[PDB]
């Protein structure tokens, strides 16, 4: 009874009835763009290494 009454009191102190307009979307978006930059560079490095292997292969 003590714990649940205390937590209903604490929830009464920090309730607002409003849907919390904060977010973390933009940072996730920028992190996704950074990772796709890295992936693009990886594919291009694979292609350059493959042409180097074709040149050295003969």
């Amino acid at each position: 009874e003590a714990e649940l009454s205390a937590q209903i009191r604490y929830l009464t102190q920090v309730a607002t009835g409003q849907p919390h307009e904060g977010s973390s979307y933009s940072s996730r978006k920028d992190c996704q763009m950074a990772l796709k930059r890295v992936d693009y560079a990886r594919l291009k490095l694979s292609d350059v290494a493959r042409t180097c292997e074709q040149m050295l292969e003969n």
Binding site: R37, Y40, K44, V48, T51, M55
Partner: protein, 43 residues
């Protein structure tokens, strides 16, 4: 006269080598340009 054919052999050899080097160089140029463009737009 055979040394002329030797010259033609090595000429064809490094013709192919130079064209492959040009492809490697073009891909490096394009990767550098893409990196600089994509990193320039992030700000």
């Amino acid at each position: 006269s055979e040394e002329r054919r030797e010259i033609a052999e090595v000429n064809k050899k490094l013709k192919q080598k130079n064209q492959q080097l040009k492809q490697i160089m073009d891909q490096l140029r394009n990767l550098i340009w893409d990196i600089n463009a994509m990193l320039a737009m992030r700000n």
